[PDB]
Amino acid sequence: ENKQVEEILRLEKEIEDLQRMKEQQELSLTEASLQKLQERRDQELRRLEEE
Amino acid sequence: ENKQVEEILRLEKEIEDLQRMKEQQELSLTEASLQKLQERRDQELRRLEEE
């Protein structure tokens, strides 16, 4: 009810902090790289939940 | 400049996955928990001066 939710707050920092390193990495090599990166992500429509 | 975007994508997955797993875990407990989560976070974001 709360003790379990309180633990989640700590997880948010991990996932949030991990994103900071990922966003900085892509913005470090080439901001434009996000363009080609967008297509790669959109190509994941025929994946997930499929055996 | 693809190996950099590729590795970055993998990093994005682990991060995005962390948020998906956390959101599911939190929602699993009770969507209402969001109230306490917000209150707790908001309580921590308070400017102090004297009283």
UniProtKB/Swiss-Prot annotation, chains A, B:
Tissue spec. comment: Ubiquitous.
Recorded superkingdom: Eukaryota
Localisation per UniProt entry: Cytoplasm, Cytosol; Cell projection, Lamellipodium; Cell projection, Ruffle; Cytoplasm, Cytoskeleton
PTM notes: The initiator methionine for isoform Headless is removed.
Coiled coil: 2-51
SS bond list: none
Quaternary data: Monomer, when in an inactive conformation in the cytosol. Homodimer in its active, membrane-bound conformation; antiparallel coiled coil-mediated dimer formation. Interacts strongly with CALM3 and weakly with CALM, the CALM3 interaction is essential for function in filopodial extension and motility. Interacts with ECPAS. Interacts with NEO1. Interacts with ITGB1 and ITGB3. Interacts with VASP. Interacts with DCC and ITGB5; the presence of DCC inhibits ITGB5 binding. Interacts with tubulin; ITGB5 or DCC binding inhibits tubulin binding.
Family: Belongs to the TRAFAC class myosin-kinesin ATPase superfamily. Myosin family.
Annotated function: Myosins are actin-based motor molecules with ATPase activity. Unconventional myosins serve in intracellular movements. MYO10 binds to actin filaments and actin bundles and functions as a plus end-directed motor. Moves with higher velocity and takes larger steps on actin bundles than on single actin filaments. The tail domain binds to membranous compartments containing phosphatidylinositol 3,4,5-trisphosphate or integrins, and mediates cargo transport along actin filaments. Regulates cell shape, cell spreading and cell adhesion. Stimulates the formation and elongation of filopodia.
Domain notes: Interaction between the motor domain and the tail leads to an inactive, monomeric conformation. Phospholipid binding via the PH domains leads to the formation of the active, dimeric form of the protein and strongly increases actin-dependent ATPase activity and motor activity. Interacts with membranes containing phosphatidylinositol-3,4,5-trisphosphate via the PH domains.
Protein name: Unconventional myosin-X
Parent-protein residues present: 883 to 933 of 2058
